[PDB]
RNA sequence: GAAAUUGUUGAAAGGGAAGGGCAUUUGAUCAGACAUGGUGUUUUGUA
RNA sequence: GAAUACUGCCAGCUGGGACUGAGGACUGCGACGUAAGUCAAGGAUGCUGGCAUAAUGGUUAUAUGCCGCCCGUCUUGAAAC
RNA sequence: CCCUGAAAAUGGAUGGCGCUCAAGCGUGUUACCUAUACUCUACCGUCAGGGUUGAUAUGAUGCCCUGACGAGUAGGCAGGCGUGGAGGUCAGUGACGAAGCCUAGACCGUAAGGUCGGGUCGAACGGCCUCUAGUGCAGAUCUUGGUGGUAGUAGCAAAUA
RNA sequence: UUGGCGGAAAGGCCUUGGGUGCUUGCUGGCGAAUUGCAAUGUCAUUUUGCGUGGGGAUAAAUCAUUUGUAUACGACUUAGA
């Protein structure tokens, strides 16, 4: 037996892979996912992980 | 003639069955859990039957083995046969119950031309 | 069609194991066994016979004979783990056992057609028999009782604890 | 002679158990003879055969051997745990049973 | 069939206590007896070497009346008819013998064995 | 070691006798025992009669016969305080239990066979000397036993004719004794001597 | 032409229930692997 | 003036026994070696025998050892008289 | 410490047998037995952190590396199994035998289940991608129908024969 | 084979005489292999059947009838060449 400390085996809680079924999306975030994994720069992590969010969190600018 | 892989192991080879199937005959032995608020079965007291979980899941390269070394692929004409004619050494074709004789001799043929395991070469034959 | 597809298929392509490291250094056998040592066969068809040992051989076993003159015991290899080495000593120096190796014995395996369904020795064999146990029984001459010795059986007795004997 | 006895007698007293649970996976042997855990300690690793009988004959024979080895001593007067291949049927209890002397280290 | 009957001395034949005379029951028996005697002796069979080899009875559809019973109720009063068949056959003389061949496997040290027992013996 | 083992019951106590044999049949040991009325148990004999009565006290209410048996012969208490320490209810205990058979005196069987004991039973070896105790053949006397006197006729008869074998076997090995030192001191005798025989 | 329930035959067990779990004995019953490419032609239908 | 006991340390030596052999071209850290190379260094190989069949094994019935109270429900609490 | 004080109703319980320099009480020292607990290893799943669009061949929701974790009523969520019907597809199966049913015969899945062999039978049915619902029973003194033990039992005895 | 003794569950113990075999008390001669490096490597006693060939002996019980010292029925007690 552990003393638990936290809740075990509990997701992160972040939406990662867009729930949407759309092919140039994830087209869009096969791109960016390999530019994320291998171009060390910031924007591409921002980027892909602001392609997966969901309508209301895409307001229109 | 498979491809080697290690010795296959069940962590569970007895069935699962139903608490009290053997008791009632209108309980079948299909696995149904215990929902009840008293059971020894659901409490899990000692000297009772175990229940199916994830812990007795099969190797994942030792599961869909038969023990030939193979794993099963139900066939029904030639069409179907000669999709596994790259693959022999996996898979194992086995005939669809309902196929008649006249053409269960042409896929047996077929198979034994094409090297291709047939797990069951006797349904329909006459003798 | 009956079942529709697998959508990948496994490759059939073998592997190669890894590189291994595990070399053969030699048998280390333990200390009571010296050549010219009487042993006692534990198991096999001589089983509670006193034979005396030769040579270690390449396969880490034990090159043996009876005298064949005494207990009929011919010359044979036996395994190490399947013996007790007595204390009682002969010295079997002046009997060229370097002839012998794996090879001098080889069985001419059978093939799976012929089979016995109801039912022969080296004249090579028979001669080097000869020749070495002539040379040890001139050895056991010399303290006595050892022919009577080797020609009698070990048995244990009722009151026999193997743990307190001393062989 | 009269006797040709290569082996040591000994007793199938039981499985490995606690008050209320077994386990046939361990045997339990009394090996006639000795008394202490330093005396038994010379039969660890033998190979232990359990021989009966039966009325059908299988392959030339009416005899049926199970075998096992001896693996460590149990408490303080003696008695070994044996293993074997196929455990010991648990009518045996009581039964006769032969520690051989081989693989010998002496 | 046979709780809550009387006991009789003559079960001491049979070694039982309960025993009884159903003479529609024998009727119907040995009436079914009698023409399978007939159709042996159509068919030409010997008719001193018969034994009956099989018989049985089981259960023919419910024949349903009415009882009147206190407190103006109604139970059934259900006859349980019989489907009986038997078959006559001619006894006849042993059955048959020359059982399976048995064949042997032995291992190298069995045939050693019984090499040197052929040899050590005559 | 032994095909069967014959206990001369007499000076033991009863219920370390009956843990030590209990222990011998389910090992699968064949045991007889033999001069069950000499047994003792550590007490007062009016402590064990007591005792004795207390359990006869025991039966059942609504009918008797289905009741405890009060078993009155010295073996059969033997056997009483031995099936306590057999689980004699299922089949290991049966196969256990029909391999003992306790008897009053030495039965002609066993009469001209070897007796032994058991030293971690023995009364003389357990007992605090001034402690006092019971015989199992005067308390089963006391309690309803009929038969102790004839017992201790046959026993007179037995000892007699032992009496009668031992002073042949005693002339037999004097002389044996006097053959083995007059045969001694030769050189067999002394190579024998010099490897411990 | 199912099941409850029943008859016959066959097999098995049964000292105040029966049924179950782990393990093995015994009896009965049963699947799979056993060719493989191969130096080779000691060869016939000569490849 | 010593020894020994007790406690503690050794990157001292060495014998017996049991269970496990996962992974699958190479890559790393090391060691012995002047070097070639070798090795117990990122997970078992080498040699040999028997059988090649119901022998191992699976299933099923029985026997034996130990264990096992009737399910569902309300309830703080159900095997519940 | 032991004894007197010390009386309850079926027969009775340091668990039983039994035990008296204990197998009792106080105390001390070792050895030993074994839990689903701890240590190591394998396997299953979950969660987390990473690697990997290069060409060839597939699946990037894929493959691979590493570490930790696994009790559960009420309840929540996820991934799946099965049924009736509908769109599409396999130019699917089938009177040389579809569906159904029986089978202490075999195989696969942790499981819901799936597949095959044999027997019976006689006219339709299935895999996959989706759509839809009158879609999964052991219970409700459930509904309708059928059948047991009781049980060859209670009984078939008023009104003269 | 002669003579005893043994009734607790004796069913066994002792003894006389001759025959026959072995003797490792001592000294010799010949054989053994190949079961291949182990595989209980098979040697015990319990019951039954069927054959031989050698002795031994040629019954009762129950139903049915009857009795009434008995009796719900079974059972019991009687009788009957
Ligand atoms: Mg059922
Ligand atoms: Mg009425």
Same mark, same amino acid.
């Given at each position: ?47 892909? +992980?602001?392609?997966?969010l ?8 | ?32 859990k ?8 659901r ?47 996996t ?20 198979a ?16 | ?14 592997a ?22 009487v ?29 064949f003159?005494?207990?009929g015991?011919?010359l ?9 080495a ?50 040890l ?15 009698? =059986?070990? =048995? ?12 | 002679?009269? =006797? ?16 209320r ?9 009394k ?19 359990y ?10 024979? +009416? ?19 044996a293993?074997?291949?196929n ?8 039964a =006769? ?10 | ?39 042996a ?33 109604i ?20 059955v ?27 | 070691?032994?095909?069967?083992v ?25 045991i ?18 007591? +005792?004795?009565?207390d ?72 007992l ?45 090995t ?22 411990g025989?």
């Amino acid at each position: 037996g552990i003393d638990h400390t936290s809740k075990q085996h509990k997701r992160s809680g972040h939406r990662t892979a867009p729930k949407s079924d759309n092919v140039y999306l994830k087209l869009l975030v096969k791109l960016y996912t390999f530019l994320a994994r291998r171009t060390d720069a910031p924007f591409n992590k921002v980027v892909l +992980k602001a392609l997966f969010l969901s309508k209301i969190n895409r307001p229109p600018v | 003639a498979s491809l080697p892989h290690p010795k296959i192991v069940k962590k569970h080879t007895k069935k699962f069955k139903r608490h009290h199937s053997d008791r009632y005959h209108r309980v079948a032995e299909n696995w149904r859990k215990q929902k009840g608020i008293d059971s020894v079965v659901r409490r899990r007291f000692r000297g009772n039957i175990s229940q199916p979980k994830i812990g007795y899941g099969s190797n994942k390269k030792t599961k869909f083995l038969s023990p030939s070394g193979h794993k099963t692929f139900l066939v029904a004409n030639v069409k179907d046969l000669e999709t596994l004619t790259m693959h022999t050494k996996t898979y194992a074709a086995e005939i669809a119950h309902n196929i008649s004789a006249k053409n269960r001799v042409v896929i047996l043929a077929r198979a034994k031309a094409l090297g291709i395991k047939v797990t069951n070469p006797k349904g329909r034959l006459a003798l | 069609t009956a079942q529709q597809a697998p959508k990948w298929y496994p490759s059939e392509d073998v592997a190669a194991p890894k590189k291994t490291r595990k070399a053969v250094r030699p048998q280390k056998l333990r200390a009571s066994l010296v050549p010219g040592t009487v042993l006692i066969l534990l198991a096999g068809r001589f089983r509670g016979k006193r034979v005396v040992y030769l040579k270690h051989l390449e396969d880490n076993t034990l090159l043996v004979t009876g005298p064949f003159k005494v207990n009929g015991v011919p010359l044979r290899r036996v395994n190490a783990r399947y013996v007790i080495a007595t204390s009682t000593k002969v010295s079997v120096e002046g009997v060229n056992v370097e002839k012998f190796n794996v090879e001098y014995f080889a069985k001419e395996k059978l093939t799976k057609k012929e089979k016995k369904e109801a039912n022969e020795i080296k004249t090579e064999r028979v001669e080097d028999q000869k020749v070495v146990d002539k040379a040890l029984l001139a050895e056991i001459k010399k303290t006595p009782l050892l022919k009577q010795y080797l020609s009698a =059986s070990f =048995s244990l007795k009722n009151g026999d604890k193997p743990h307190l004997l001393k062989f | 002679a009269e =006797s040709h006895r290569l082996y040591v007698k000994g007793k199938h007293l039981s499985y490995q158990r606690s008050k209320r649970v077994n386990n046939p996976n361990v045997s339990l042997i009394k090996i006639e003879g000795v008394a202490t855990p330093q005396d038994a300690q010379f039969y660890l690793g033998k190979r232990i055969a359990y021989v009966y009988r039966a009325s059908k004959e299988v392959r030339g024979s +009416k005899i049926r051997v199970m075998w096992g080895k001896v693996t460590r001593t149990h408490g303080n007067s003696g008695v070994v745990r044996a293993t074997f291949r196929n455990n010991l049927p648990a009518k045996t209890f009581g039964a =006769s049973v032969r520690i051989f002397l081989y693989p010998s280290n002496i | 069939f046979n709780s809550s009957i009387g006991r009789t001395a003559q079960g001491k034949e049979f070694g039982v206590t309960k025993a009884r005379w159903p003479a529609k029951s024998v009727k119907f028996v040995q009436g079914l007896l009698q023409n399978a005697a007939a159709n042996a002796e159509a068919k030409g069979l010997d008719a001193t070497k018969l034994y009956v080899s099989h018989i049985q009875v089981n259960q023919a559809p419910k024949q349903r009346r009415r009882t009147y019973r206190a407190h103006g109720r109604i139970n059934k009063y259900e006859s349980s008819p019989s489907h009986i068949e038997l078959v006559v056959t001619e006894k006849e003389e042993a059955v048959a013998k020359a059982a399976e061949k048995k064949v042997v496997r032995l291992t190298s040290r069995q045939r050693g064995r019984i090499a040197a027992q052929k040899r050590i013996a005559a | 070691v032994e095909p069967v083992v014959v206990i001369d019951g007499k000076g033991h106590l009863v219920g370390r006798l009956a843990s030590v044999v209990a222990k011998q049949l389910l090992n699968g040991q064949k045991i007889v025992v033999v001069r069950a009325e000499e047994l003792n148990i550590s007490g007062e004999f009016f402590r064990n009669k007591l +005792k004795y009565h207390d359990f006869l006290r025991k039966a059942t209410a609504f009918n008797k016969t289905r009741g405890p048996f009060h078993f009155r012969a010295p073996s059969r208490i033997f056997y009483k305080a031995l099936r306590g320490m057999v689980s004699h209810k299922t089949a290991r205990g049966k196969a256990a239990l029909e391999r003992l058979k306790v008897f009053e005196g030495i039965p002609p069987p066993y009469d001209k066979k070897k007796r032994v004991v058991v030293p971690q039973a023995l009364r003389v070896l357990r007992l605090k000397p001034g402690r006092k105790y019971t015989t199992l053949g005067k308390l089963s006397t006391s309690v309803g036993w009929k038969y102790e006197d004839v017992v201790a006729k046959l026993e007179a008869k037995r000892k007699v004719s032992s009496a009668e074998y031992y002073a042949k076997k005693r002339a037999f090995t004097k002389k044996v004794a006097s053959a083995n030192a007059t045969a001694a001191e030769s050189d067999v005798a002394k190579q024998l001597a010099a490897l411990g025989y």
